[PDB]
RNA sequence: UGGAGAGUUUGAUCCUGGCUCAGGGUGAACGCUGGCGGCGUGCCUAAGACAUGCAAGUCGUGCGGGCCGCGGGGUUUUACUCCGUGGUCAGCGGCGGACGGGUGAGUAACGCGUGGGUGACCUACCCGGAAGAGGGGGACAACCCGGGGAAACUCGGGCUAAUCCCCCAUGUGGACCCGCCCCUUGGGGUGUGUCCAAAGGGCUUUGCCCGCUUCCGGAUGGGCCCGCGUCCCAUCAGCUAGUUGGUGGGGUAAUGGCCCACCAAGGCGACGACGGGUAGCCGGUCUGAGAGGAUGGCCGGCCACAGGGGCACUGAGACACGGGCCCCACUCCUACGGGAGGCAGCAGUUAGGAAUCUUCCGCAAUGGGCGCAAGCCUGACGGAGCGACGCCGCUUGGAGGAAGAAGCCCUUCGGGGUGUAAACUCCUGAACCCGGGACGAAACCCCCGACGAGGGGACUGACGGUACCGGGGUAAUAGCGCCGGCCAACUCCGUGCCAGCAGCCGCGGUAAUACGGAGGGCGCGAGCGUUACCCGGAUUCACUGGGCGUAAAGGGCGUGUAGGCGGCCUGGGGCGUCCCAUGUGAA
């Protein structure tokens, strides 16, 4: 199935991830279906997480499955906040 | 040495037999039905035709034929059987065939 | 869009099939001038309907054989053996180009 | 935000023309030299051969067991026998092993690029919707009993569970024949007939969780087809017999000579067929003013390959690198019968070579497989290690300091040079020492809420006692090339067409700024030179952007085939050409 997961993009000791949609079977850094966010785990800037809940919600609706820290990040942007 | 891809192997040899058998049963039944129609033996020819239609759809149940491969086989068969009783049949036991 | 080409039937010699000759101008990548250039398609003709010289639109289509992947869609201009003749001489020439000559 | 030229044919000249330099680039290697760090990068050759270790498994919440323990029962006691529980092992079964990872050998091909087509198709796991699980039956491992082989391993007999196999039923629905309607290639309806379903498991047990069945849709991935693009040789000119097309079969998820039988005699080529050579293709890279040229190495995408050659099984998917069979070549075992292998996974060894790294740490992060979960596996990966191999940052000190030591070097014998350089005065304080010491990590999980949204909690760091912060604190490596012109920089001695230099032009035949050394000078600087290769200057294959009376170049002349090209006026079409919109042009 298609996943929502992290793609490692920074540099040696400088991790930045792209939050991506992709078939589970790509390499982690290979061709992805759509970037739908980014994550800087060092919080080196004020702007260290970013999602696009609209698209995130889209891919969930067609059954993308997010990895365990992708969903954590998605939640942190209120992808799932329903109230 | 040793894996249990080893297991995967011997499991396959099992399936290789299950499939082979199921499929033999069809070929040999389908032929039998076709030949009963070349003889215009309509009631009996359909009685076999319907059993073979079954063993086919039954094959497709699990991973032997599956699909539209059974549909292929079914069609190919039901064609020849109707077309071979064009030779003065009148489908008697009238099973397999739409009026 | 299934591709549609327009051409000249230059062969009836087959059962349910016509050779169709299709030209295409275009400017030459480096040297500019407009170059003609052509290619023969084998097309599906199930009524053996179209005849030597007819100008037909030919359409992309699901394979009929090796070679045959087009069907003759409609008839544009009926009859004109100049094109056929033009094409015909071109292959007449071929005979010359070899290892001998004279009356050959 | 874009274009520099020079040296060399002559006694001199102008032109033609080649050769050479200056510039940029590099997975480099070689020489002399070598201090720190960050980030990259590192078998170009043998797709040669490979020791050793590790590299794909997981699930007891599908099933039944063996072995080793412990505990509770039925009896008055033993014997026998029943139940519970701990460890362990494989077996049956499910999912994964078709991904990830390696390489570029082959391949000039729908292989790749790009844009389309599929009324000619498939898609496990995932999401949405509709509906369903009622009866019954069977076998094979495990285990038990025997045989055979040295071994790898193998044969026979008996028992048994299941989410293993089958039969009947239910038919939402679907498949197939025939018909009918709408569509229009095999798209979507509809009727009769026929055919086709299912599996159980766990509980904080009646109602939840995880599964199972059929169908319809989505999503992702893929098959196949087509237009167009894709190197050199014509001293390769003709090629083809499944060849080209038809009919009907076979085969497949599906179109197709894909394969087969029969029939017709086609198909292809100078717009380069057939043959030979070479090569993985692209995103991109380098160069260039551009147009071009060159290239495909890191990373990303496609393809192909897994000692060489075939092949099919299983399966959603493979004709499968760590699966199966056969043939070939090697190496190993061998009781001579027969067996065991396959680093182009990570390291590592050897061989070839001018040359290419550690048998390192860790699953903490990201990602993948299985598992309800706990977790397990992961040489993917995250790091560390080696090499100046590249890039970038940084140090070997700063301020003062003579009319100006000493040595060395010139000298017109007065002087001049190295040279504020050193010595020396003061100042700072790379190295080193002490102390604190990270970010990367918040989820899974547990509690509350409702296993939702939301809130609370706990656990977790290979790198690493590193980064960085603070306190101490020492004047602490300089090399290499060049100095005739092109080309920045000249003097002495030695040498005598020798020894030697030399990119090109040319130096050396006793007063050499060209050889060798010295002093000095120029250029770069932890580097500087050399070789090799690429583009450039090279308008020196000229499209941009050249030529042919005598420099190289008009065919000995014609004829006229293909082809190229084509006077003036009107009209239609709108192929070329131009315009707008739009889609594509991933990272
Ligand atoms: Mg298993
Ligand atoms: Mg001369
Ligand atoms: Mg001269
Ligand atoms: Mg001159
Ligand atoms: Mg390094
Ligand atoms: Mg190599
Ligand atoms: Mg391990
Ligand atoms: Mg046990
Ligand atoms: Mg087990
Ligand atoms: Mg070739
Ligand atoms: Mg294409
Ligand atoms: Mg569903
Ligand atoms: Mg038995
Ligand atoms: Mg079953
Ligand atoms: Mg039934
Ligand atoms: Mg090659
Ligand atoms: Mg140029
Ligand atoms: Mg090898
Ligand atoms: Mg092979
Ligand atoms: Mg499967
Ligand atoms: Mg199969
Ligand atoms: Mg495999
Ligand atoms: Mg393969
Ligand atoms: Mg291997
Ligand atoms: Mg290795
Ligand atoms: Mg050697
Ligand atoms: Mg390394
Ligand atoms: Mg993980
Ligand atoms: Mg790594
Ligand atoms: Mg934190
Ligand atoms: Mg954990
Ligand atoms: Mg000078
Ligand atoms: Mg002298
Ligand atoms: Mg000298
Ligand atoms: Mg010189
Ligand atoms: Mg530096
Ligand atoms: Mg040029
Ligand atoms: Mg030249
Ligand atoms: Mg020109
Ligand atoms: Mg010229
Ligand atoms: Mg002359
Ligand atoms: Mg001449
Ligand atoms: Mg003349
Ligand atoms: Mg002449
Ligand atoms: Mg003419
Ligand atoms: Mg004109
Ligand atoms: Mg003309
Ligand atoms: Mg037009
Ligand atoms: Mg555009």
């Amino acid at each position: 199935m298609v996943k929502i997961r992290l793609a490692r993009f920074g540099s040696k000791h400088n991790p930045h991830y792209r939050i991506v949609v992709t078939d589970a079977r790509r390499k982690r850094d290979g061709k992805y279906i759509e970037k739908i966010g980014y994550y800087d785990p060092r919080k080196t800037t004020p702007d260290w997480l970013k999602v696009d809940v609209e698209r995130a919600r889209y891919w969930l609706s067609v059954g993308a499955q997010p990895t365990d820290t992708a969903r954590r990040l998605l939640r942190q942007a209120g992808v799932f906040r329903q109230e | 040495r040793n894996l249990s891809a080893l297991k995967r192997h011997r499991q396959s040899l099992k399936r290789r037999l299950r499939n082979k058998a199921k499929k033999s049963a069809i070929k040999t039944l389908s032929k039998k039905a076709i030949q009963l129609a070349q003889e215009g033996k309509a009631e009996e020819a359909l009685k076999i035709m319907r059993k073979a239609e079954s063993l086919i759809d039954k094959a497709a149940k699990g991973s032997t034929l599956h699909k539209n491969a059974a549909a292929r086989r079914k069609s190919r068969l039901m064609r020849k059987v109707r077309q071979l009783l064009e030779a003065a049949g009148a489908p008697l036991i009238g099973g397999g065939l739409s009026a | 869009p299934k591709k549609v080409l327009t051409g000249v039937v230059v062969s009836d010699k087959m059962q349910k099939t016509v050779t169709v000759l299709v030209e295409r101008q275009f400017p030459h990548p480096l040297y500019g001038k407009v170059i003609k250039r052509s290619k023969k398609y084998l097309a599906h003709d199930p009524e053996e309907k179209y005849k030597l010289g007819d100008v037909v639109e030919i359409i992309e289509s699901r394979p009929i054989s090796k070679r045959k992947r087009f069907r003759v869609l409609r008839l544009v201009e009926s009859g004109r053996m100049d094109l056929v003749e033009k094409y015909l001489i071109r292959r007449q020439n071929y005979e010359s180009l070899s290892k001998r000559g004279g009356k050959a």
Side-chain angles (χ1 to χ4, degrees), chain B residues 48-96:
Chain B
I48 303 287
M49 211 255 288
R50 270 181 280 105
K51 176 60 176 166
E53 163 168 26
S54 207
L55 301 199
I56 300 201
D57 270 326
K58 284 182 157 155
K61 224 41 192 163
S63 54
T64 317
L65 289 197
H66 262 99
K67 325 213 61 53
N68 35 17
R72 218 164 62 241
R73 274 140 171 281
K74 245 153 87 185
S75 179
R76 223 145 278 197
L77 190 271
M78 273 176 170
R79 308 191 43 76
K80 295 160 191 174
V81 171
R82 203 186 263 265
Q83 304 176 178
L84 265 161
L85 309 185
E86 322 278 285
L92 260 283
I93 210 165

Side-chain angles (χ1 to χ4, degrees), chain A:
Chain A
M1 84 271 269
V2 47
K3 299 284 286 289
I4 298 185
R5 54 150 183 259
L6 263 45
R8 222 267 198 182
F9 263 94
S11 35
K12 195 205 286 267
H13 303 286
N14 181 18
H16 292 61
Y17 302 102
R18 293 197 189 168
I19 294 142
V20 305
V21 175
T22 183
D23 187 321
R25 304 174 278 202
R26 285 274 172 210
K27 36 190 83 185
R28 83 150 138 70
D29 296 340
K31 163 188 285 176
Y32 59 71
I33 309 181
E34 171 185 350
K35 176 181 139 186
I36 48 144
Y38 57 80
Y39 171 46
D40 167 30
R42 263 111 58 79
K43 316 112 181 169
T44 53
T45 82
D47 194 5
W48 56 284
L49 186 50
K50 178 59 54 206
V51 167
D52 179 314
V53 309
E54 189 24 67
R55 286 263 86 194
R57 294 224 183 83
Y58 168 78
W59 279 108
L60 286 183
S61 60
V62 280
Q65 225 76 30
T67 52
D68 252 0
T69 36
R71 166 186 273 113
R72 178 202 128 201
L73 290 175
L74 287 176
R75 196 181 303 290
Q76 201 181 310
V79 173
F80 306 107
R81 186 99 43 169
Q82 48 198 197
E83 189 77 21

Side-chain angles (χ1 to χ4, degrees), chain C residues 3-86:
Chain C
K3 186 115 189 59
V4 199
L5 311 202
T6 296
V8 183
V9 186
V10 308
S11 179
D12 256 319
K13 256 72 177 158
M14 262 166 308
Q15 303 193 337
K16 289 176 179 162
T17 299
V18 285
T19 300
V20 178
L21 191 32
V22 201
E23 262 182 23
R24 49 175 206 103
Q25 299 162 338
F26 70 91
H28 179 283
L30 186 51
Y31 295 142
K33 78 146 37 188
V34 152
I35 53 194
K36 263 196 279 159
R37 198 120 305 180
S38 36
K39 183 217 266 206
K40 280 181 312 194
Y41 293 83
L42 263 305
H44 189 60
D45 180 15
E47 261 86 60
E48 263 268 30
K49 172 175 294 158
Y50 305 90
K51 257 44 203 160
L52 244 180
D54 297 7
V55 154
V56 277
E57 276 176 9
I58 264 54
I59 202 170
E60 198 183 338
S61 34
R62 160 259 279 196
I64 306 83
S65 52
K66 221 166 154 195
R67 304 294 310 262
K68 282 175 73 173
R69 284 91 212 291
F70 289 87
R71 311 183 287 181
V72 183
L73 199 177
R74 46 173 219 73
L75 173 49
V76 200
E77 192 221 291
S78 180
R80 48 177 312 164
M81 306 284 298
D82 40 7
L83 310 183
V84 194
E85 267 275 7
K86 200 227 294 180

